[PDB]
Enzyme design. Structure first.
Site, PDB file in Angstrom:
ATOM      1  CB  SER B 200      -0.999   0.025   1.160  1.00  0.00           C
ATOM      2  OG  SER B 200      -2.160   0.766   0.795  1.00  0.00           O
ATOM      3  CD  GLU B 329      -5.396  -4.466  -3.996  1.00  0.00           C
ATOM      4  OE1 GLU B 329      -5.529  -3.808  -2.930  1.00  0.00           O
ATOM      5  OE2 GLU B 329      -4.347  -5.086  -4.268  1.00  0.00           O
ATOM      6  CG  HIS B 442      -5.504  -2.750   0.702  1.00  0.00           C
ATOM      7  ND1 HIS B 442      -4.858  -2.663  -0.514  1.00  0.00           N
ATOM      8  CD2 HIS B 442      -4.941  -1.807   1.498  1.00  0.00           C
ATOM      9  CE1 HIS B 442      -3.930  -1.724  -0.451  1.00  0.00           C
ATOM     10  NE2 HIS B 442      -3.963  -1.187   0.758  1.00  0.00           N
TER      11      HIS B 442
END
Ligand SMILES: *[C@@H]1O[C@H](CO[C@@H]2O[C@@H](C)[C@@H](O)[C@@H](O)[C@@H]2O)[C@@H](O[C@@H]2O[C@H](CO)[C@@H](O)[C@H](O)[C@H]2NC(C)=O)[C@H](O)[C@H]1NC(C)=O
Ligand SMILES: *[C@@H]1O[C@H](CO[C@@H]2O[C@@H](C)[C@@H](O)[C@@H](O)[C@@H]2O)[C@@H](O[C@@H]2O[C@H](CO)[C@@H](O)[C@H](O)[C@H]2NC(C)=O)[C@H](O)[C@H]1NC(C)=O
Ligand SMILES: *[C@@H]1O[C@H](CO)[C@@H](O)[C@H](O)[C@H]1NC(C)=O
Lengths: 530, 535
Positions: B200, B329, B442
């Site tokens: 990320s 995601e 995520h």
């Protein structure tokens, strides 16, 4: 003397002719005058009713074709010649035809009225593919078709002026519909049951009569094949109409609207025709110079607006498309295309092609088209690019305008039936890559395969008979379905059901290219306004 | 004293700790200071190198977490607490960690350097999920991880000013990388073989070190997990960074709006850390998900141009990169503000709720742009089906924020000289505590990459242990050779290219090669939408 072939209409007496079919005889009255010849000072003017005559009008043969452009892209080729004039050209061309069962029906028979297509620049009621003898024999309707003025003669407009108001070819059709109200009973037809059907510009024409109140009293049901009044080619604004008329005058050597039209009236018809294509603002396909104009009169608003705002309770409509609406048009200007090769284009040709197939929009708009019609896993594959540009032209001009008409009508009170025509004729002369092109359901609707002198298969004749039955059932009842045995369901904005028409039994499916048509109908207008 | 646990670095002497692992002992030096504490007068300023010390510093436990907001959306819930600070908060937080094999390597050993994510507002090198002991034991690399300042402390910017220039968090990261160059050889590490990896915001940081010449000389290869420096949440322009800094100051009484930069910053420096943290979220221009207040600023200095422009215009010959995304995601982000969403129900939203979510998920764009998004992500044969609308809003958020920036980075790099490998991670951990609808969210590949399933106290399946071992092997092969493939009969992982666009699926099954990272969708985000925004 055969009395079945003698008829008296309001204007006087007619002599018709007995025709043969494999199913038995039919009575025909061909070349009946419905207007005064729109000649000399009457060029560009609304039609006037035909004055009464004495003696007997010979109605045994088709009359002259309205002055129009003659296609020369592929001389002698069947695929183009079948659409070309098959009688002499004249401005004296306002005649109509009536086919009736033999002997003449003695009780009210339902009436089908055919309006031909040809992009408002071409067409004739006398074309072999529009021969009414098979429908009339097999389904026992009365069938009428008319000639109407095309090109500049029918659609040149200097808005505001009285010398060239525009939409006169549309008024030629209305006058023929009025003639039917007044005279069809003399043939055994029922004036209270008149179904309009047309293809392409003929379909756009039908839709325009739907949206114009003086026409709406003249018929009861509607069939729109591969065309719609809201198609981006089917109308023109007042400003662009004036520009095109004015450029036509300049190109043929004429200079005040009154002086302009007077000079145009001194020019031979053929000369107007010779410059017709040159008044278009850009290189294009599926665009025609002289089309209906939105000016407050025949159409009080754009057809799009009139459709969105109209009440359509009590209307039944039959609409549909062929499997490959775009393919025919690609050989008239898209780079890389030809009927005589595989037309396996390159990405560059595809990109240039998009500006030809979607003329007169911003670069941004064009980019959006390229996004929605590219497969980003195969951006450069020739066969996929050929198919995608076909889709672009077909969706933009035909499929999505028809889908939007169908959705809005169904949601606003009408009962709608939808089809996709998916059979490729055994006799088709266009190459295989074109699939089922624009115009090629018509011969099946008119029962042309039943003609012994032609080469259709046994299956194809049975298919034509099925189609003739659907169309005539719709004319008689507002519903194409036969008695229960697979049923043809009504189209609605949510479920979006339509049927495939081919040699197999009916298959019910969902969505008229819904993903693509969301683009043309929902998103693209917003983009163009910003 | 144990000789393996003693090391001298340029600053002075260190004492470390011996760690048990399922496969054998590892040496760890946790909590090594690499900068002077950014206290008081040094708040918002670039890091100063740590001054040399006499005697021995005990590097025997993780140091404090940099000051940050603490998630309370679901108190006590494992799925959120795992990301929360696990040491006390402090501005005194600039420490790094080294793990090394025991005994110390005899010849120079390739180095992996971890950069954590957390939206530039949160995160720490101390989280259990970033425990480096398993990678080091399994693959015999050296592993380094650093803390870096986040939130206003790391990324508040008044561009032009010397007192709060912005990007000091990235400078924290760079200082640590300079530390690895100068000192890693003392632990047996090879400074000529250094591979950055991050997830990320950490992946976006890695991408920024790629695009900044003074960072680029400090490493050789790069791994970007579920993020990219060109993501629309990852950087901010100068004017917007100024606006956000100025609003924060205003909301905490400074100055007693705007004015002299020197004065405004001096007043901010008198505020307790927690006071700044409590106002952090209030400076965002609209309600949103996947947007964070204080992030790297494009001001010509660290980033001479936008990451997008720098990627498009760069020569990447000599570079190997490994990139990828998880299977879902967008899903994690939806329960933080999209109407109708909860971890505790099925989140089966209405059409009106979908339309409303589009503006939250794609904030601060024109009505026309929002309409283009709705066009692309609506199934017009099923425009109102709740389950499909849920999945579509997840795809919108995930594509826009993660997948498409990653696809674009991968394609440009491949086309402009780099060797690129790409993956999609498709295994849903047997232990996952978020609801089933969220799929693989995520952040949930990290525990596998770090070999956490090898930890006996946890309850992963045997297959997952095998999976973790495969992944650790791919990552280390990439760190050693620039190629994740095994130096036989096993399925090969092909390079990603702009044309074929090939990537592999990472799950319990063997590698399966596929084509296109959401190609149709990403053509919308990367090719068309920017033209619409300019016009
Ligand atoms: C397929 O044909 C097109 C169109 O060309 C016409 O028909 C061909 C059968 C052949 O007789 C051509 O010479 C005709 O012009 C080809 O496109 C054209 O290419 C020529 C050069 O050869 C060029 O000068 C024209 O401008 C092009 N015309 C168009 C409509 O773009 C095309 O090359 C052929 N594609 C193939 C080989 O698959
Ligand atoms: C699913 O949950 C959301 C969010 O609500 C939370 O979790 C639920 C399980 C329940 O405990 C709620 O009370 C929680 O607030 C629901 O959305 C909300 O609806 C209420 C009023 O009905 C409203 O005050 C909130 O703002 C809404 N939250 C939003 C818009 O995110 C949603 O309705 C639930 N879906 C259902 C019930 O099927
Ligand atoms: C702002 O105030 C400080 C403190 O007195 C001063 O040193 C500085 O030069 C001032 N800045 C400007 C540009 O006025």
């Amino acid at each position: 003397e055969d009395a079945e072939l003698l008829v008296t209409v309001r204007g006087g007496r007619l002599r018709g002719i007995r025709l043969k079919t494999p199913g038995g005889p039919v009575s025909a009255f061909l070349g009946i005058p419905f207007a005064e010849p729109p000649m000399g000072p009457r060029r560009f003017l609304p039609p006037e009713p035909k004055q009464p005559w004495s003696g007997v009008v010979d109605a045994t043969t088709f009359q002259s074709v309205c002055y129009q452009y003659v296609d020369t892209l592929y001389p002698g080729f069947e695929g183009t010649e079948m659409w070309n004039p098959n009688r002499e050209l004249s401005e004296d061309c306002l005649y109509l035809n009536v086919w009736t069962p033999y002997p003449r029906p003695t009780s009210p028979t339902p009436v089908l009225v055919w309006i031909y297509g040809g992009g408002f620049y071409s067409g004739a009621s006398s074309l072999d593919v529009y021969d009414g003898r098979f429908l009339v024999q097999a389904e026992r309707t009365v069938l009428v078709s008319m000639n109407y003025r095309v090109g500049a003669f029918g659609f040149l407009a200097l808005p505001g002026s009285r010398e060239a108001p525009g939409n006169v070819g549309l008024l030629d059709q209305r006058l023929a519909l009025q003639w039917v109200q007044e005279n069809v009973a003399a043939f055994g037809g029922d004036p209270t049951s008149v179904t309009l059907f047309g293809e392409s510009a003929g379909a756009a024409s039908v839709g325009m009569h739907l949206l114009s109140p003086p026409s709406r009293g003249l018929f009861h049901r509607a069939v729109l094949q591969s065309g719609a009044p809201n198609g981006p080619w089917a109308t023109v604004g007042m400003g662009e109409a004036r520009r095109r008329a004015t450029q036509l005058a300049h190109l043929v050597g004429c200079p005040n609207d009154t002086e302009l039209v007077a000079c145009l009236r001194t020019r031979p018809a053929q000369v107007l025709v010779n410059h017709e294509w040159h008044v278009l603002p850009q290189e294009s396909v599926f665009r025609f110079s002289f089309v209906p104009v939105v000016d407050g009169d025949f159409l009080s608003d754009t057809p799009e607006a009139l459709i969105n705002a109209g009440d359509f309770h009590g209307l039944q409509v039959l609409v549909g498309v062929v499997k490959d609406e775009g393919s025919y048009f690609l050989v008239y200007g898209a780079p890389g295309f030809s009927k005589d090769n595989e037309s396996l284009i390159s990405r560059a040709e595809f990109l240039a092609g998009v500006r030809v197939g979607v003329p007169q929009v911003s670069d941004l708009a064009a980019e959006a088209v390229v996004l929605h019609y590219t497969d980003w896993l195969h951006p450069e594959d020739p066969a996929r690019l050929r198919e995608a540009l076909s889709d672009v032209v077909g969706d933009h001009n035909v499929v999505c305008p028809v889908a939007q008409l169908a959705g809005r009508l169904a949601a606003q009170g009408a009962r709608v039936y939808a089809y996709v025509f998916e059979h490729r004729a055994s006799t088709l002369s266009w190459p295989l890559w074109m699939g089922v092109p624009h115009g090629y359901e018509i011969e099946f609707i008119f029962g042309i395969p039943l003609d012994p002198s032609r080469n259709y298969t046994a299956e194809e004749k049975i298919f034509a008979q099925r189609l003739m039955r659907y169309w005539a059932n719709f004319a008689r009842t507002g519903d194409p379905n036969e008695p229960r045995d697979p049923q043809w369901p009504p189209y609605t904005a949510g479920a979006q059901q339509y049927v495939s028409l081919d040699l197999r039994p009916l298959e019910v499916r969902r969505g008229l290219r819904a993903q693509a048509c969301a683009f043309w109908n929902r998103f693209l207008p917003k983009l163009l306004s910003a």
